[PDB]
Amino acid sequence: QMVKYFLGQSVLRSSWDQVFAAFWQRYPNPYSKHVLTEDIVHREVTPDQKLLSRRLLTVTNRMPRWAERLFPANVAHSVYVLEDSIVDPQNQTMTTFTWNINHARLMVVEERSVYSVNSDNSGWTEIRREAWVSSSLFGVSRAVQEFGLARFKSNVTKTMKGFEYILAKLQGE
Amino acid sequence: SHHHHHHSDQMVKYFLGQSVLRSSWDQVFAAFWQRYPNPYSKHVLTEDIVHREVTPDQKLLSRRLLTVTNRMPRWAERLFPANVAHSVYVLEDSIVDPQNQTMTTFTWNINHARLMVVEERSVYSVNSDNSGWTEIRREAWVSSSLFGVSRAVQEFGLARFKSNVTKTMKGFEYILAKLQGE
Amino acid sequence: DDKMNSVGEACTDMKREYDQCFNRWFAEKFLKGDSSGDPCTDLFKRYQQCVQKAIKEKEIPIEGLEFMGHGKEK
Amino acid sequence: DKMNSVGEACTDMKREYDQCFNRWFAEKFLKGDSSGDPCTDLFKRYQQCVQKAIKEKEIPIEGLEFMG
C-alpha cells in the first residue's frame, strides 16, 4: 500500500539520565562504520527548558546491485540525513525526528522516535519508533501508465480514420 | 454503436472499446493488409511479415512486425534518456477464420518492455444489427514494470532501515558500557 | 511513391510484390470459398529468408515468443 | 576517536564544542536548569564555519519546518 509503515518498540537498560547524554556521544562506534560526518547545525533552548537541536550527518550509500543499474544517477552520492531532537528532563523524555534530504526522488524514509523511562522498570528507558518509507517513483509509474493509454487511445482513433479512408479507396477502384 | 471505457484493473489499466465499420466483412479483412500506408499512419515506419501459414482447418495464421515512432513527452526523456534512441517494435499476431467470418488480432510491443507494455486483443466480426457491416471489439491492457520496482525500492528501503536500527541500538548499548566504567 | 518500406532495406524490393500477390490471393479465392492452391509461397520463402537475415543483423527479439498471449500475456 | 565534520576545517573545532556541551549537558542541564550556557562563545564560531562548509557542498536545508 502506497507508503509502508513500521512500528517498533525497544528498551535499553540504563537510566533515562544516562542515555540522553550518550545520545550525543555515539559517534564513532564500531557499528556506525557507515556514518561519515555529523554536525549540530542548530541548537536553541526554550522557556520551558527543552533542548531543541538539529543535527545533520552524512551516511554512505549502499544499494543492491540491481538498483545502481536502474538508478546510475545516485550511486556516487552519499545520503544527507537530518535529525530533530527535543529533550525534556522535567518530564524525562526526548523525541527525535529523522529523514534523508537528498535522494528524495527515489525514496524518503523518516522516523519519529520517543525516548522515555521504562514503564515497569524505572532504571531503564523505553523507546518507541514509527516509520514511513515512501518513494515518489509510484507517482511516476502512474504517469507512465496514464501517458501510455492516452497515446493508445489516440492511436486507436487513427486506425479507424486510416481504416475508413482506405476502405473508401477500394470501393469502385 | 461506437463507445469505450477504461478502469484500473489490479495495478494495470484495462481498456474496452467497440467500433463498427460501415463496410462488408470481406473488404475489411482484405483492407487489413493494406491500411499501411495511409494519411493517419505517419508514425509507423516499416511493416513486415515474419511468419505466415495455412492451418489444416483453413484459417490463416499471420504474424506481422511493425516499427513505430517513439515520441515520449518531454518530462519522460529526462527520466528515461536510454529509451529516446530506439523506435518501438511491435508484433501483432492474427488468425483469420473464413468459415465463421471472424478474425482476431493480438498486438503488443517487444522493446521498451522494461518501461511500459501495451497489449490489445481485437476481434473483427460480422455485425448482427446490419449484416452489411463489420463490428469490431477491442480490449487492451497497459502495464508497467515501474510499479514493481517502486515496491522493490520500498522493500529494500525498509530492510536497510531495520538493519540500521539494530546498529544504532547495538552501538548505543556500547557507549553506555564505556561510560558506566565497563 | 505509395507502398510500405521494410526492415531489411534491401527486401523492400523483395517485399512489395509478394504483398500485392497475397492480396490478389487473399481476396479472390481464400476469403471467397476454397481455392486450395497458393501461387505466392514460391516468392514468400526468398522474401522472408531475406528478412530472417535482417532481423538478426538488427537484433530484434522475435524468437522466444509464442502465438497470442501464451508467450507474453501481460 | 575524532568523528570529522562536513567542513574538514572545523573537525577538531567541533571536538572542542562537543566536550564543552556534554559537560554542560550532563552536569547542570539534567540535574536542573542552573545557570546559562557557557559554550555559546565557542558555538557561535562553530556555526558560522559550518554554514560556510554546507553552501560549499550545496546541502539542501530550505529552513525546513522543525520536526519536518
Residue numbers in the entry:
A (entry chain C): 11 to 183
B (entry chain F): 2 to 183
C (entry chain A): 11 to 84
D (entry chain H): 12 to 79
Task: Recite the paper's sentences.
Thus, lipid transfer proteins of the Ups/PRELI-family shuttle phospholipids across the IMS in a phospholipid specific manner. The partner protein TRIAP1/Mdm35 has an important role in mitochondrial import and folding of the PRELI domain as well modulating its membrane affinity. The Ups/PRELI lipid transfer proteins are widely conserved in eukaryotes and can be classified into two subfamilies by sequence similarity (Ups1/PRELID1 and Ups2/PRELID3).
In contrast, substitution of K58 by valine or threonine substantially increased the ability of PRELID1 to transfer PS, but only moderately affected its PA transfer activity. We therefore incubated PRELID1–K58V with 1:2 DOPS-DDM micelles as described by Watanabe et al. for Ups1 and PA, and following nickel purification, and SEC were able to confirm by MS that DOPS was able to displace the E. coli derived fatty acid, albeit incompletely. PRELID1–K58V incorporating DOPS formed readily crystals and diffracted to 2.98 Å. The PS molecule docked in the observed electron density was found enclosed within the cavity of PRELID1–K58V with the serine group positioned at the bottom of the pocket and the acyl chain pointing towards the entrance of the pocket. The R25 side-chain, which is located near the PA phosphate of the Ups1-PA structure, is shifted towards the serine moiety in PRELID1–K58V. The smaller V58 side-chain of the mutant now allows the phosphodiester linkage to pass comfortably through and extend deeper into the cavity and the acyl chains of PS occupy the same channels as for PA. Interestingly, in the PA-bound Ups1 structure, additional space was observed beyond the phosphate deeper into the cavity and in our PS-bound PRELID1 mutant this is now occupied by the serine group from PS.
